[PDB]
Design a protein around this nucleic acid. Structure first.
Ligand code: SF4
Ligand SMILES: [Ca+2]
Ligand SMILES: [Ca+2]
Ligand SMILES: [Ca+2]
Length: 350
DNA sequence: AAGACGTGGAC
DNA sequence: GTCCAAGTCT
């Protein structure tokens, strides 16, 4: 049916030739491949590079990561987004240490039982690190295959991914699955790009139904995103006389879990300074807002308003709250939105 | 199934 | 503005 060998040859030769020397490609420690694959979920290669370098310098092996304090691991992820990824990884390595004594399982089902490890990450890690011939279908590979085999199913359905997964097993080169899997990923990065794909340069120009029919720009097929809710948020930056600032740790469930923030209130309607004033009551005086700005998430947009305030100590500071010397805020992991809050507060203070 | 879950860069 | 970023949990 499908000229697998001729296809594989023009792909893998292209790949030994064009492969980028990325940091996590220096070797095949499963730990390092695994860390990189988690960081790369919904995140551009170029963004990941500096975080990977710093993360592995802090946590050079699996037990280092497991032994480390949740707070330390989260701070190393600060700014990357989708922070549940690193809680899942941390939990997952703790389990690989206790349960399996430090060795990354090479059994798919056992590896996949670990938190964070879905079908993509099973494929990527096991095919690169241990040679296991599982497909590693990322969003890019779904685009590639959609264009190659002219598969028009919505790639948002879980079922479509399962179809693409089966296709990969058929066309795969079981002689070297790691390189096969990498090469498809690399092809989507370097040639078969979301817009204006470089089909003329493409190595597998000859096997591409979409190019033949002239529709590469028309793929892949994906349901248009839903518009996201908007959420007004009042944020208090409260300083006492010695310059200390009040922060609090978000709970471990839901949005931006276990990250630190300046005390904040979702103000569906009005009464920002009021709804804020009452929440810290549950001794503070808040002045007029100093800035308003938006911050996007995938599924909502915060509309933040920052209110300065003076803190007067009439009691102890009870969890989740913490009294932080300004010079110590850098120790805590904050979301990018509250990083900006602080920046805006300090430039107003000038 | 399809919503929750961050952030940034290239059109 | 849109689409994607080497997805996964619920
Ligand atoms: S010929 Fe174009 S559309 Fe087909 S795989 Fe190559 S870059 Fe993608
Ligand atoms: Ca799994
Ligand atoms: Ca919660
Ligand atoms: Ca990709």
């Amino acid at each position: 049916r499908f000229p697998a060998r001729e296809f594989q040859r023009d792909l893998l030769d292209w790949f030994a030739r064009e492969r980028r020397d990325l940091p996590w490609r220096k070797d095949r420690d499963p730990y390092k491949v695994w860390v990189s694959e988690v960081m790369l979920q919904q995140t551009r290669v170029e963004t990941v590079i500096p975080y990977f370098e710093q993360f592995i310098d802090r946590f050079p092996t699996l037990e280092a990561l497991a032994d480390a304090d949740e707070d330390e691991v989260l701070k190393a992820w600060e700014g990357l987004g989708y922070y549940s990824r690193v809680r899942n990884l941390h939990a997952a390595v703790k389990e690989v240490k206790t349960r399996y004594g430090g060795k990354v399982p090479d059994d798919p089902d056992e590896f996949s039982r670990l938190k964070g490890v879905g079908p993509y990450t099973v494929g990527a890690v096991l095919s690169l690190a241990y040679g296991v011939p599982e497909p590693a279908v990322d969003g890019s590979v779904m685009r590639v295959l959609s264009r190659l085999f002219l598969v028009t199913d919505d790639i948002a359905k879980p079922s479509t991914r399962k179809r693409f997964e089966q296709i990969v097993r058929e066309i795969m080169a079981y002689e070297n699955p790691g390189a096969f899997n990498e090469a498809l990923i690399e092809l989507g990065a370097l040639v078969c790009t979301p817009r204006r794909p470089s089909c003329l340069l493409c190595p597998v120009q000859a096997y591409c139904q979409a190019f033949a029919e002239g529709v590469a720009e028309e793929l892949p097929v994906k349901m248009k995103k839903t518009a996201v809710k908007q959420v007004p948020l009042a944020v208090a930056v409260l300083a006492d006389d010695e310059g200390r600032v009040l922060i609090r740790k978000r709970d471990s469930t839901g949005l931006l879990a276990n990250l630190w923030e300046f005390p904040s209130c979702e103000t569906d309607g009005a009464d920002g300074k009021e709804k804020l004033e009452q929440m810290v009551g549950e001794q503070v005086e808040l002045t007029e807002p100093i800035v308003s700005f938006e911050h996007a998430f995938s599924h909502l947009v915060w509309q933040l308003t920052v209110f300065p305030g003076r803190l007067v100590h009439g009691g102890p500071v009870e969890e989740p709250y913490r009294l932080a010397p300004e010079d110590e805020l850098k120790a805590y992991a904050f979301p990018v939105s509250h990083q900006r809050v602080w920046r805006e507060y300090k430039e107003w203070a000038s």
